[PDB]
Write a protein that binds this ligand. Structure first.
Ligand SMILES: *[C@@H]1O[C@H](CO[C@@H]2O[C@@H](C)[C@@H](O)[C@@H](O)[C@@H]2O)[C@@H](O[C@@H]2O[C@H](CO)[C@@H](O[C@@H]3O[C@H](CO[C@H]4O[C@H](CO)[C@@H](O)[C@H](O)[C@@H]4O)[C@@H](O)[C@H](O[C@H]4O[C@H](CO)[C@@H](O)[C@H](O)[C@@H]4O[C@@H]4O[C@H](CO)[C@@H](O[C@@H]5O[C@H](CO)[C@H](O)[C@H](O)[C@H]5O)[C@H](O)[C@H]4NC(C)=O)[C@@H]3O)[C@H](O)[C@H]2NC(C)=O)[C@H](O)[C@H]1NC(C)=O
Ligand SMILES: *[C@@H]1O[C@H](CO[C@@H]2O[C@@H](C)[C@@H](O)[C@@H](O)[C@@H]2O)[C@@H](O[C@@H]2O[C@H](CO)[C@@H](O[C@@H]3O[C@H](CO[C@H]4O[C@H](CO)[C@@H](O)[C@H](O)[C@@H]4O)[C@@H](O)[C@H](O[C@H]4O[C@H](CO)[C@@H](O)[C@H](O)[C@@H]4O[C@@H]4O[C@H](CO)[C@@H](O)[C@H](O)[C@H]4NC(C)=O)[C@@H]3O)[C@H](O)[C@H]2NC(C)=O)[C@H](O)[C@H]1NC(C)=O
Ligand SMILES: *[C@@H]1O[C@H](CO)[C@@H](O)[C@H](O)[C@H]1NC(C)=O
Ligand SMILES: *[C@@H]1O[C@H](CO)[C@@H](O)[C@H](O)[C@H]1NC(C)=O
Ligand SMILES: *[C@H]1O[C@H](CO)[C@@H](O)[C@H](O)[C@@H]1O
Ligand SMILES: *[C@H]1O[C@H](CO)[C@@H](O)[C@H](O)[C@@H]1O
Ligand SMILES: *[C@H]1O[C@H](CO)[C@@H](O)[C@H](O)[C@@H]1O
Ligand SMILES: *[C@H]1O[C@H](CO)[C@@H](O)[C@H](O)[C@@H]1O
Ligand SMILES: [Ca+2]
Ligand SMILES: [Ca+2]
Ligand SMILES: [Ca+2]
Ligand SMILES: [Ca+2]
Ligand SMILES: [Ca+2]
Ligand SMILES: [Ca+2]
Ligand SMILES: [Ca+2]
Ligand SMILES: [Ca+2]
Ligand SMILES: [Ca+2]
Ligand SMILES: [Ca+2]
Ligand SMILES: [Ca+2]
Ligand SMILES: [Ca+2]
Ligand SMILES: [Ca+2]
Ligand SMILES: [Ca+2]
Ligand SMILES: [Ca+2]
Ligand SMILES: [Ca+2]
Ligand SMILES: [Ca+2]
Ligand SMILES: [Ca+2]
Ligand SMILES: [Cl-]
Ligand SMILES: [Cl-]
Ligand SMILES: [Cl-]
Ligand SMILES: [Cl-]
Ligand SMILES: [Cl-]
Ligand SMILES: [Cl-]
Ligand SMILES: [Cl-]
Lengths: 418, 418
């Protein structure tokens, strides 16, 4: 087999080989035998010189259009002479040149990756095309510097490279939602030729954040006289997720007792906590309960918060006077110290607001004695004479130590007999 | 201050204290002084024995109805004597007993936790109620043995416990979707009393699985004569998620070239890959393309798979005989060795299916000569005499080396002249 190598895309008139010498034809015989290539197609690309007997390129040859991705491109040639008419055979090897640069069919590649994609997941990329073969084909892929993505290039069944995008670090759309990358494919030509593609990565949102309250817990003070409809506090919570998944609404915890719901209500949009009814420090001095903020995701994320409402005592009770026992009538002969009445006082308020003092006018022949807390006896403190006064209206005044103090008035009526 | 402790729910006649001796009353004069409890309410629960002067329980006292959740329960008592008329005061401390067991308001508690909940996330639980106070109130919560959940119990300023369920290890609904737990609350009484609640936690599904092919790649061999509509392979992929997120459908990759789409089709539900048109080993010997499986989730998860289809050569071409040149007429005086015809053969099949041998009948005065691959010249091999035979019909037979071989027949017609 006579084999001539010649590079593809060679100019018209390029020397391939001297077939006349290799077929053992005489030079003078060459001008007579009129050696020519047989076959209509091959006459477009090859020609035989009548003077030298050289096989020459007629029209440039494209190896890619002829053999595609085959490793070797060999063109069998047949020749004809006259006198006598004879046929000869030779093979022309078309040697590949690097007339193709790597090129991605689309130069804009867009990937949408979920925010919760696990590191180690591979994402396919469309590979560049290089119609050349051998070392002139694609030799490596490159990915521009970044912090979350790397390249994982796989070799498929024939030995072509298949590039895949590999997630190295977890994503977080709340920190970075978009990545702009450049992907490069380079062949092993001399010099290497390359082509690039722009890779835009989008991070899709997951509902991975619960709402966050402004403070971890709230403690509030309110006077027990506060009217219904007063705003105690406005709860604020934020959620960084997108759309309804970042939309915060407020409510009581599911386990909130009705004793809380009776006095407090929570506006679902504004988070304003209002007072719904009368408070009373004397019955309950504080309330502890939990509230929650929910996002509008499906399903929803929840966050709880602890609320404490402290009541402040108000001096809303005047002292209560109990006259336990009462003489009614007293002999004018009674010795000083005679008990006229037993008196008890109570004030339900706290601290100084509930501390009671008792008094009567000085000018009376009576006095107040106390042996135990909040207990007073009304006794005679001087002599009595019916002819002077037949009866006494003894004005008793109880007062608490609030500011200002509140007073209670009670009159003990006492008849005097002989 | 005279203070007597007495446990709540004590029977009638229980000894509280010797008030007379603490009030410093003469022992011989009790029947005269007639020490008595003052106040209608306190007279329902306490009475003074006239002979001994001891304060006794009349009707049993409920500490819970009196003080609720307060730590200390103190009842001021007032007493009255006659001869002389006097008032005395003492305090009774009502001591809590352990007459309340812990009790959850609901015996069935249900939690729905997302499969992708991060470890360390907390979930509220409805606390049990124990109306007692002090050591008789709830002292600890317990959670049955398990591997993913623990308790995080918070202590408030008054001593109330707030139980929270704490996720310790990551969940996976594809491995276990339901957890059955019992939650227990115990007080610190002697003996300790407790109550339980049934806790059912369910794991909600996330679309965290892409479909999985049975094999990482498939390689198929098919004869180039295979008829249209033949099933080459059935792709199988599973997706363990729930609902549409676990429903798999098949398709070609988005970038699949039309030369592939023209010959192969993929049923979206069954995954059967069928043949759509004629194959030809002589023009194309293999096809490589990617297929994908998508679930019905929103957004959809997909996994790609690489397919390679290799064609097998069939002996579907008999050799082709080309008679390049033919003398047609020959003089009987011509010397042996004269070339009568030029013959080239070709068979497009590969291997033994494409190797051609040539022959002619033995008895003829002709022979076949070959100087180049697949080129034969028909020459005279003996003397020729016109008077004997004026013309020859030379039967040339080409055969390939297939089993069974395929043959081609061509006759060279030759006239002889004088
Ligand atoms: C993707 O997945 C698909 C589906 O997978 C299946 O379905 C899913 C849902 C799962 O359950 C999965 O586990 C399943 O596998 C899968 O396609 C299947 O591929 C299988 C092979 O890989 C194939 O199995 C064959 O089934 C034949 C019967 O099928 C009939 O019934 C089924 C179910 O009802 C129908 O779908 C189907 O259309 C048919 O109607 C079965 O006969 C084959 O076994 C014979 O052949 C074997 C090798 O060819 C051989 O090893 C076996 O031993 C058996 O050989 C026969 O043995 C009997 C008894 O010994 C002989 O009978 C006796 O003969 C003696 C004389 O010899 C005497 O006459 C006695 O009297 C007589 O009883 C008989 O002669 C033997 N035959 C031969 C030819 O030798 C084989 O098991 C499934 O059908 C496929 N399913 C479908 C739905 O198509 C794909 O493979 C997966 N894809 C990939 C890429 O893997
Ligand atoms: C939950 O969030 C809400 C809302 O938050 C606000 O909106 C968010 C979108 C975001 O932007 C966030 O940053 C905002 O703060 C909270 O409610 C807000 O609370 C703050 C603080 O408690 C209040 O600020 C006060 O604003 C008034 C003016 O408010 C008028 O105009 C507002 C619009 O700009 C309206 O929204 C109001 O309705 C009202 O019409 C200021 O006057 C206050 O400053 C003065 O008083 C404080 C002490 O209270 C002093 O420290 C300051 O120095 C100011 O004093 C004045 O100074 C001038 C000049 O020196 C002097 O001439 C005056 O005499 C001084 N006056 C006095 C009285 O000394 C505050 O800045 C917001 O009004 C309130 N907004 C709403 C809508 O309610 C809420 O607190 C939060 N929840 C929790 C638990 O934190
Ligand atoms: C939340 O939902 C309401 C309707 O309920 C809508 O008007 C609002 O725009 C949404 N987003 C925010 C941030 O409030
Ligand atoms: C997928 O959805 C279709 C809708 O009709 C249903 O018929 C089919 O059974 C589903 N897939 C599986 C694997 O069940
Ligand atoms: C692509 O890459 C090749 C090799 O790195 C370069 O030679 C070319 O200029 C292009 O940048
Ligand atoms: C790679 O770089 C080329 C320019 O060399 C661009 O055309 C391409 O879009 C990518 O950025
Ligand atoms: C709750 O726990 C207490 C103390 O462990 C038991 O006595 C009771 O039976 C219940 O199981
Ligand atoms: C805890 O266990 C008790 C039985 O000891 C049940 O009655 C209760 O409902 C919970 O399961
Ligand atoms: Ca070319
Ligand atoms: Ca080339
Ligand atoms: Ca190239
Ligand atoms: Ca995030
Ligand atoms: Ca998010
Ligand atoms: Ca959210
Ligand atoms: Ca009050
Ligand atoms: Ca008060
Ligand atoms: Ca008061
Ligand atoms: Ca009780
Ligand atoms: Ca208890
Ligand atoms: Ca109790
Ligand atoms: Ca899972
Ligand atoms: Ca899942
Ligand atoms: Ca899935
Ligand atoms: Ca064929
Ligand atoms: Ca064939
Ligand atoms: Ca053949
Ligand atoms: Cl590479
Ligand atoms: Cl609510
Ligand atoms: Cl009274
Ligand atoms: Cl009065
Ligand atoms: Cl006495
Ligand atoms: Cl009594
Ligand atoms: Cl505990």
């Amino acid at each position: 087999q006579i084999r001539y190598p010649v590079p593809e895309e060679s100019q018209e008139g390029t020397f391939v080989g001297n077939v006349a010498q290799d077929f053992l034809l005489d030079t003078e015989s060459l001008s007579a035998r009129r050696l020519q290539v047989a076959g209509e197609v091959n006459q477009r690309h090859f020609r035989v010189d009548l003077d030298s007997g050289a096989l020459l390129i007629k029209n440039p040859i494209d190896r890619e259009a002829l053999c595609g991705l085959s490793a070797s491109c060999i063109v069998p040639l047949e020749f004809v002479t006259e006198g006598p008419l004879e046929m000869y055979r030779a093979e022309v090897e078309i040697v590949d040149v690097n007339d193709h640069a790597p090129r991605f069919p689309r130069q804009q590649l867009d990937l949408e990756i979920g925010e919760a994609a696990p590191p180690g997941q591979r994402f396919p990329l469309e590979k560049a095309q290089d119609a050349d073969v051998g070392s002139n084909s694609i030799s490596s892929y490159r990915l521009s510097s970044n912090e979350h993505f790397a390249l994982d290039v796989k070799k498929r069944s024939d030995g072509s490279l298949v590039p895949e995008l590999l997630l190295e670090k977890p994503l977080d759309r709340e920190k970075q939602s978009d990545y702009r990358l450049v992907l490069t494919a380079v062949d092993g030509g001399n010099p290497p030729r390359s082509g690039t593609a722009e890779l835009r990565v989008s991070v899709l949102d997951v509902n991975d954040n619960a709402p966050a309250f402004q403070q971890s817990s709230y403690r509030i003070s309110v006077l027990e006289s506060a009217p219904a409809g007063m705003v105690l506090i406005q709860l604020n919570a934020s959620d960084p997720d997108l759309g309804p998944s970042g939309n915060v609404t407020f409510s009581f915890s599911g386990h909130t007792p009705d004793r809380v719901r009776n006095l407090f209500s929570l506006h679902p949009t504004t988070g304003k906590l209002t007072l719904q009814g009368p408070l009373d420090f004397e019955s309950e001095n504080y309330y502890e309960f939990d509230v929650r903020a929910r996002d509008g995701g499906s399903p929803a994320m929840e966050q709880h918060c602890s609320l404490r409402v402290d009541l402040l005592d108000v001096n809303d009770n005047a002292p209560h006077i109990t006259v336990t026992s009462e003489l009614g009538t007293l002999p004018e002969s009674a010795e000083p110290g005679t008990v006229v009445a037993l008196i008890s006082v109570q004030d339900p308020d706290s601290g100084s607001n509930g501390d009671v003092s008792l008094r009567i006018p000085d000018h009376l022949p009576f006095a107040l004695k106390s042996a135990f807390r909040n207990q007073f006896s009304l006794v005679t403190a001087g002599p009595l004479d019916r002819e002077a006064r037949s009866s006494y209206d003894i004005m008793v005044t109880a007062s608490d130590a609030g500011n200002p103090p509140l007073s209670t008035h009670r009159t003990i009526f006492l008849n005097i007999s002989d």
